[PDB]
Design a protein around this ligand. Structure first.
Ligand SMILES: *[C@@H]1O[C@H](CO)[C@@H](O[C@@H]2O[C@H](CO)[C@@H](O[C@@H]3O[C@H](CO[C@H]4O[C@H](CO[C@H]5O[C@H](CO)[C@@H](O)[C@H](O)[C@@H]5O)[C@@H](O)[C@H](O)[C@@H]4O)[C@@H](O)[C@H](O[C@H]4O[C@H](CO)[C@@H](O)[C@H](O)[C@@H]4O[C@H]4O[C@H](CO)[C@@H](O)[C@H](O)[C@@H]4O)[C@@H]3O)[C@H](O)[C@H]2NC(C)=O)[C@H](O)[C@H]1NC(C)=O
Ligand SMILES: *[C@@H]1O[C@H](CO)[C@@H](O[C@@H]2O[C@H](CO)[C@@H](O[C@@H]3O[C@H](CO[C@@H]4O[C@H](CO)[C@@H](O)[C@H](O)[C@@H]4O)[C@@H](O)[C@H](O[C@H]4O[C@H](CO)[C@@H](O)[C@H](O)[C@@H]4O)[C@@H]3O)[C@H](O)[C@H]2NC(C)=O)[C@H](O)[C@H]1NC(C)=O
Ligand SMILES: *[C@@H]1O[C@H](CO)[C@@H](O[C@@H]2O[C@H](CO)[C@@H](O[C@@H]3O[C@H](CO[C@H]4O[C@H](CO)[C@@H](O)[C@H](O)[C@@H]4O)[C@@H](O)[C@H](O[C@@H]4O[C@H](CO)[C@@H](O)[C@H](O)[C@@H]4O)[C@@H]3O)[C@H](O)[C@H]2NC(C)=O)[C@H](O)[C@H]1NC(C)=O
Lengths: 670, 668
């Protein structure tokens, strides 16, 4: 039971070609087709196979100048590297058809930096219309060094250097086994060698590979530097997607804090020390990541000009709040208009749409960029291509750093200040005439840890012989990951008259740290959408059964590329990798419970689905409604004005079963 | 040694009258002309001596009240003082003709604060079109208290009180000598006791009298508080001039750092301690100059209010940058144009032009003024007329304080942030069709120190008797940097025949690393050496160009004693006349090494477009519609600087004789 999808031989061919660019990523097979086309490919001579002539020439101009050398680390957060990435993306996106697209990737893999290429190529496959429906490997299969500490990395290296185990039994005690023709490596989360503060409690979440790959997916789906022109009426709601993405993720993070006894994400000042540090154990090719000690002074010599920028960015927003209505960025904005949320979000992300342009420019300095650089505590880059990476230089590592959550909580707080100007919904807006929820019932909600393996072969260098012979896939990494049991939500609805309806399900905390019940007024942004769907109500008594497994907000685990090749010989592709790649993983749906059962609550809401005026299906079928994201909790609430018979608040408890500590899965037996 | 200009008889009469007001600036001679003319001058009954009636009555209202008393320190950075100086300048400037101008000046010289008079009088001579061509004493001869370290001033004061040397041989050992019945005092640059840090490595540039004069000259040529409408077409480029001046200056200064092992100008924060202190040997016979210790906290109670001001003034700028387009001060500004460069400069200088007005008003607060008050470290003024002075209170002492370069480095950087909005030069805008530089050769470039004298008689007091003979002869001797003349020869192959513009720049070749600078991060670090137009021939030719001819450098000022002797022959010095606001030649090159210090010479040739027929506020304004600093007025894409009509040459700057100036001042 891996949810499948059938496909033709023409599809199979194209999909194989796309997959080839994700194998043995840091090396080149002289013998492979991609290299022969690549080496010799003449872009100027093929000007006519591109939709956009200017993009070809913009690129040619830069490429004559020189692009980033191979082997250096690539981050989109630096001007010059970004500009190269984008000129490349444009080449990919404006290729007339697949053949030209493919051949261009071939050229780019041969001649350009690996990270820059993978970055642009991954986005291309997502953005190109003729590629819609095709599949990409999970980011942990492509950048495995980014999803693992150096301990595991070094074992992998040592084994490769020895061409095997010199002592299988000694290797066993380090968590290394041959299984088949694979080397399998057990890995712990970093707290197993490092407890430098309370935040290390949250490692099975913040270091979780799906959680991290998910951030990377979100960014690739719609990067800040590019317009959202291609996504239809999403353009008018971009800032809303930006806010909601972070609001949801920060709610989910907050739950993990609660169940680990830690309370609220702390507030900071660009002029004061920040208390909690980050000691990364990742390696890249020629450096470690940068450390931030505890009590790092954000306002040192090197950050003076940066903080002046950051500080002005915020205060400009504060000035907006004070003004209510203003002209900025060539738009008349009114903070009483709920639609202003588009501008607000666009402002904080400093995205292409803030300016109504196709692509952002170096002179449009980003807040998130400069905040990331400040809190990362790296020294000044050596030059435009040589920096010291911190977790916050990459979408695939950001979630690892406590400061990451502090930064986005700050932005999200500011957006919440804007939402204070919005009129709270009245009874009449929420009341579903003649409809009452009479009971909600939930099976036991229970988390557990469970071993998961992924292909880490891109972390290794292979020899001439092995590359020729395709023996290039033998490194696995096994790691306990959070999961929960499937469960049913039973909803009994009463309605006089039959009617089409929307049902939404959220998860929220029950109490603050003091154990006072949370009131809606203060905590409407602490709610996490679990599911939305439509049903048909009939006169009388209704019963709606929804399995967690059918919740639409979440996806199943990716399959390795290895099983996709096998599948593609049967004419099959893994459905959840095709249509649902950028959803949160299902197995991280619930926060880790407690043996006694930690208290949360479900919010269930039912309202009329009379038509479908405004609905999104270009980005994907998320909002089949002209309703705000997170309705009816997208603005502030008054408890008395809110409670309505078609809402129901149910108290629940989240349990944990089996081992509570992941490292207990990684002990060798004696 | 100097270029002369023949000059007729009418001129000499007028020039002499002018220079005579600069004699014994600090006391009054009851028997001098100026005094009798001042006494005979009924200010009340002579409204018709002036072009502007409003200006006349304005001054009168003020004068009935009262002006800054004699002897106190004058600084244009304090409101009431500025308003009084401006009123007096209005008077000088609106004087119907040279006669009324002279009388007013005599009047002012007698009844007014001498510092305020000198300030206003300098500017008036430079600005009045009937005085445009006349010459002025160097600032160090008119205000020698701002160019003499205290030790020297005291050595002179005690020699005066003694009426000469008790014993030649004690005197000698103290660097005091008799020469042609004149006293010569030898002067060292200040020791770690004045710059308690690394910035003392450079005291020979920062204390240099030419460099400090230069800054005084640049201010007087166009004061921030005045309108630029007198220069017509130039007004649209005032902010451009402001940028260019500081950018060039800081580029020159950074080169001196590099040769003394010093690196980047430190950056600072109003909310943090400033690392590098300054202790000036200057006093105002009332207060000593305010000192700034090392690691001085800018954000202390007495600065809370001013920092608030400086902080928004900066952040308002950021908000401009973020918004691309916006209305400000009447205007709608789009940062993609050049009406932008001008605005940006004007913004940062809060000059009169920024408000589209003739003079700065009472209540329009200046960023530079408060930046300087905070960095200057002084306790708050005691009243309207009495402040505690700092080096940053005067144009003639500003260049002496490390903080000065840090302050202007900050502004210049903010302008560079704006410049990222400017569209870069393309191949076609830079390529000179059918012209190529095939080679550049340069003579040995050699720096060295040698002695330079000035008359410091202005800070010495004389008796009634002595005054009757207007007396001088108190000379200060100081080693000063200098270079030997050299020739640049350029080799050019060209297809056809036009006038060309030849431009030369000096830039660093490596950073403090030892790493080659790339043009992307170096264009701001080039200073212009020269500009000239050339007839180009078909085929192969050689342009030869000597340093002594470089358009942006001047010879040394002559002291008045020498000016008087030249005037006696029908001559004046060209450079003091045609180009006082240009940097001195001796400072053309930063101190080299015996070794030879690696820099690069940038040689640019582009087509000449005959344009403007103007009337110049500075010599930096050459008759060309190109930007100042072109092609280094803005961000560069390094791959367009490979046109055949560009040559980058590695040059090495040598040094000869003693490396340290203090070895030039040792006794026996
Ligand atoms: C220890 O530290 C030191 C100091 O950092 C390291 O030194 C660095 O080493 C780099 C090599 O790794 C080196 O970079 C290369 O330099 C080449 C030469 O650069 C000069 O020339 C080019 C162009 O040539 C023309 O120039 C003049 C002027 O017009 C002409 O008259 C000539 O005849 C030539 O026609 C200029 O542009 C430069 O300014 C220099 O003057 C570079 O050409 C070379 O570029 C190539 O690599 C780039 C990325 O790899 C790529 O974008 C570019 O397109 C080039 O591609 C060629 O090379 C690749 C392999 O690099 C090859 O596979 C292709 O087929 C293709 O031919 C390099 O960039 C740095 O200059 C140097 N740093 C310094 C300060 O010197 C040192 O490596 C390190 N050592 C160790 C052990 O760690
Ligand atoms: C992930 O993280 C977990 C959490 O740390 C790691 O778990 C540790 O693994 C180590 C090493 O692999 C374990 O050590 C071994 O414990 C053995 C048995 O239990 C002990 O009995 C002893 C002996 O009397 C008691 O005194 C102890 O307190 C233990 O309870 C022990 O047999 C074994 O001894 C070996 O090493 C010693 C070196 O001095 C030799 O003398 C001896 O010959 C033998 O070789 C080990 O010490 C440790 O217990 C585990 N941690 C915990 C908390 O249980 C995982 O290994 C990590 N997984 C990966 C892949 O890294
Ligand atoms: C500008 O700045 C420079 C450098 O600071 C300064 O030069 C210094 O000047 C002083 C005197 O003016 C000079 O010292 C004199 O030094 C000589 C030389 O002594 C040498 O030989 C000694 C052994 O015989 C040895 O011990 C020394 O180290 C040195 O190599 C010396 O003859 C003098 O001796 C004394 O005379 C005084 C009289 O006041 C007595 O008090 C004392 O008892 C001695 O008899 C005297 O010390 C010093 O060396 C110079 N410094 C340097 C670093 O070279 C300039 O004077 C200053 N110039 C001006 C115009 O301001």
């Amino acid at each position: 039971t891996i949810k499948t999808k059938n496909v033709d031989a023409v599809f199979v061919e194209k999909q194989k070609k796309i997959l080839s660019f994700f194998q043995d990523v840091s090396q080149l097979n002289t013998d492979d087709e991609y290299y022969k086309i690549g080496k010799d490919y003449d872009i100027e001579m093929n000007m006519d196979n591109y939709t956009n002539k200017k993009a070809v020439e913009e690129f040619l101009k830069m490429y004559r100048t020189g692009f980033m050398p191979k082997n250096l680390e690539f981050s989109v957060f630096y001007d010059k590297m970004r500009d190269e990435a984008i000129a490349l993306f444009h080449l990919f996106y404006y290729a007339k058809d697949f053949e030209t697209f493919y051949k261009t990737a071939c050229f780019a893999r041969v001649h350009l930096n690996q990270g820059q290429f993978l970055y642009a190529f991954y986005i291309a496959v997502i953005q190109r219309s003729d590629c819609h429906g095709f599949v990409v490997p999970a980011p942990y299969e492509v950048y495995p060094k980014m999803f693992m500490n150096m301990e595991v990395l070094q074992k992998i290296y040592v084994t490769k250097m020895q061409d095997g185990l010199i002592n299988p039994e000694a290797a066993a005690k380090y968590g290394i086994h041959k299984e088949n023709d694979y080397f399998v490596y057990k890995a712990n989360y970093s707290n197993a060698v490092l407890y430098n503060n309370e935040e290390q409690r949250l490692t099975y979440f913040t270091e979780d590979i799906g959680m991290n790959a998910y951030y990377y997916y979100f960014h690739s789906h719609l990067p800040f530097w590019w317009t959202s022109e291609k996504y239809g009426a999403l353009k008018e709601r971009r800032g809303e997607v930006y806010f909601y993405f972070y609001q949801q993720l920060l709610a989910r993070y907050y739950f993990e804090r609660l169940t680990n006894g830690l309370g609220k994400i702390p507030e900071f000042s660009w002029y004061s020390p920040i208390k909690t540090g980050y000691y990364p154990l990742m390696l890249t090719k020629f450096t470690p990541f940068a450390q931030r000690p505890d009590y790092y002074n954000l306002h040192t010599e090197e950050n003076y000009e940066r903080v002046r920028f950051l500080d002005t960015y915020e205060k400009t927003f504060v000035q907006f709040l004070q003004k209510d209505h203003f002209e900025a960025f060539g738009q008349k904005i009114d903070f009483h208009d709920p639609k202003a949320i588009n501008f607000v979000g666009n402002y904080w992300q400093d995205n292409a749409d803030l300016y109504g342009e196709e692509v952002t420019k170096d002179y449009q300095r980003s807040y998130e960029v400069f905040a990331r650089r400040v809190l990362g505590a790296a020294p000044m880059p050596f030059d435009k291509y040589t920096f010291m990476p911190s977790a916050m230089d990459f979408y695939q590592t950001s979630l690892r750093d406590p400061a990451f959550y502090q930064l986005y909580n700050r932005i999200v707080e500011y957006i919440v200040e804007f939402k204070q100007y919005l009129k709270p919904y009245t009874q009449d807006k929420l009341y579903f005439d003649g409809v009452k929820i009479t009971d909600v019932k939930v099976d036991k909600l229970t988390t557990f840890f469970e071993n998961f393996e992924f292909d880490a072969s891109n972390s290794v260098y292979f020899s001439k012989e092995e590359i020729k012979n395709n023996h290039v896939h033998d490194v696995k990494v096994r790691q306990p990951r959070l999961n929960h049991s499937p469960f049913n939500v039973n909803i009994e609805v009463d309605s006089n008259v039959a009617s089409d309806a929307v049902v939404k399900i959220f998860l929220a905390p029950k109490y603050d740290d003091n154990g006072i019940p949370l009131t809606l007024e203060d905590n409407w942004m602490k709610f996490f959408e679990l599911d939305w769907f439509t049903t048909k109500l009939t006169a009388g008594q209704n019963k709606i059964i929804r399995n967690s497994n059918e919740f639409v907000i979440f996806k199943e685990d990716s399959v390795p590329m290895t099983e996709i090749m096998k599948m593609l010989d049967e004419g099959k592709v893994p459905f959840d990798m095709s249509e649902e790649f950028c959803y949160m993983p299902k197995r991280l749906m619930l926060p880790r419970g407690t043996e006694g059962g930690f208290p949360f609550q479900l919010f269930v809401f039912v309202y009329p689905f009379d038509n479908k005026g405004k609905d999104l299906a270009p980005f994907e079928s998320f909002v089949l409604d002209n309703k705000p994201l997170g309705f009816p909790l997208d603005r502030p609430v008054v408890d008395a004005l809110f409670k309505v018979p078609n809402m129901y608040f149910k108290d629940i408890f989240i349990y944990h079963e089996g081992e509570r500590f992941p490292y207990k899965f990684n002990i060798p037996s004696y | 040694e100097f270029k002369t200009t023949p000059v007729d008889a009418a001129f000499v009469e007028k020039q002499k009258k002018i220079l005579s007001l600069f004699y014994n600036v600090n006391e009054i001679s009851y028997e001098a002309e100026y005094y009798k003319v001042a006494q005979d001058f009924n200010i009340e009954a002579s409204k018709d001596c002036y072009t502007n009636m409003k200006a006349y009555e304005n001054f009168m209202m003020m004068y009935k009240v009262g002006f800054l008393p004699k002897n106190l320190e004058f600084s244009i950075f304090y409101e009431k003082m500025r308003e009084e100086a401006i009123a007096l300048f209005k008077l000088f400037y609106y004087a119907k003709d040279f006669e009324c101008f002279y009388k007013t000046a005599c009047y002012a010289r007698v009844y007014m604060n001498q510092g305020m008079f000198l300030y206003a009088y300098y500017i008036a001579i430079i600005q009045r079109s009937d005085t445009a061509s006349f010459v002025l004493p160097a600032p160090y001869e008119a205000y020698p208290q701002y160019f003499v370290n205290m030790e020297v001033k005291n050595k002179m004061d005690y020699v005066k009180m003694m009426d000469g040397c008790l014993d030649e041989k004690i005197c000698y050992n103290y660097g005091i000598i008799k020469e042609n019945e004149q006293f010569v005092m030898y002067a060292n640059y200040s020791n770690s006791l004045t710059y308690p840090n690394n910035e003392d490595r450079i005291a020979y540039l920062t204390e240099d009298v030419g460099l400090n004069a230069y800054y005084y000259y640049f201010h007087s040529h166009l004061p921030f508080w005045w309108n630029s409408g007198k220069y017509g077409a130039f007004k649209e480029r005032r902010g451009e001039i402001y940028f260019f001046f500081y950018q060039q200056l800081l580029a020159r200064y950074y080169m001196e750092r590099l040769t003394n092992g010093l690196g980047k100008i430190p950056e600072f924060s109003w909310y943090s301690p400033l690392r590098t202190g300054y202790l000036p040997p200057f006093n105002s016979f009332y207060y000593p100059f305010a000192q700034r210790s090392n690691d001085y906290e800018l954000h202390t109670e007495k600065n809370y209010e001013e920092i608030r001001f400086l902080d928004i003034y900066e952040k308002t700028f950021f908000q401009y940058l973020q918004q691309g387009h916006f209305k400000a001060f009447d205007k709608k500004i789009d940062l993609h144009s050049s009406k932008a460069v001008n605005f940006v400069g004007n913004y940062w200088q809060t000059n009169a032009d920024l408000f589209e007005e003739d003079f700065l008003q009472f209540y329009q607060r200046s960023y530079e003024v408060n930046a300087r008050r905070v960095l200057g470290a002084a306790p708050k003024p005691f009243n309207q007329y009495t402040f505690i002075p700092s080096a940053l209170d005067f144009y003639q002492t500003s260049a002496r304080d490390p903080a000065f370069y840090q302050l202007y480095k900050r502004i210049v950087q903010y302008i560079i942030e704006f410049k990222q909005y400017q569209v870069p030069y393309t191949q076609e805008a830079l390529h000179f069709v059918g012209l190529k530089i095939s080679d550049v050769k340069v003579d040995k470039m050699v720096t060295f120190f040698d002695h330079f004298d000035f008359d410091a008689f202005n800070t010495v007091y004389f008796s009634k008797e002595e005054l009757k003979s207007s007396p001088h002869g108190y000379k200060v001797r100081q080693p000063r940097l200098n270079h030997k003349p050299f020739t640049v020869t350029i080799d050019i192959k060209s297809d056809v025949a036009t006038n060309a513009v030849v431009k030369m720049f000096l830039g660093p070749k490596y950073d403090e690393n030892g790493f080659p600078f790339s043009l992307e991060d170096n264009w701001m670090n080039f200073y212009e050496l020269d500009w000239f137009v050339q007839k180009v021939n078909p085929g192969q030719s050689q342009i030869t160009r000597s340093s002594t001819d470089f358009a942006f450098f001047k010879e040394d000022s002559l002291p008045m004693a020498e000016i008087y002797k030249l005037l006696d022959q029908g001559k004046i010095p060209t450079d003091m006349f045609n180009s006082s606001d240009t940097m001195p030649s001796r400072l053309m090159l930063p101190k080299g090494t015996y070794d030879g210090f690696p820099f690069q010479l940038f040689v640019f040739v582009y087509p000449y477009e005959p344009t403007p027929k103007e009337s110049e506020p500075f010599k930096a304004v050459v008759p060309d519609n190109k930007p100042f600093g072109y092609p280094f007025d803005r961000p560069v894409l390094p791959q367009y600087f490979k046109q055949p009509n560009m040559f980058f040459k590695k040059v090495l700057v040598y040094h000869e004789g003693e490396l340290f100036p203090y070895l030039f001042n040792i006794p026996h």
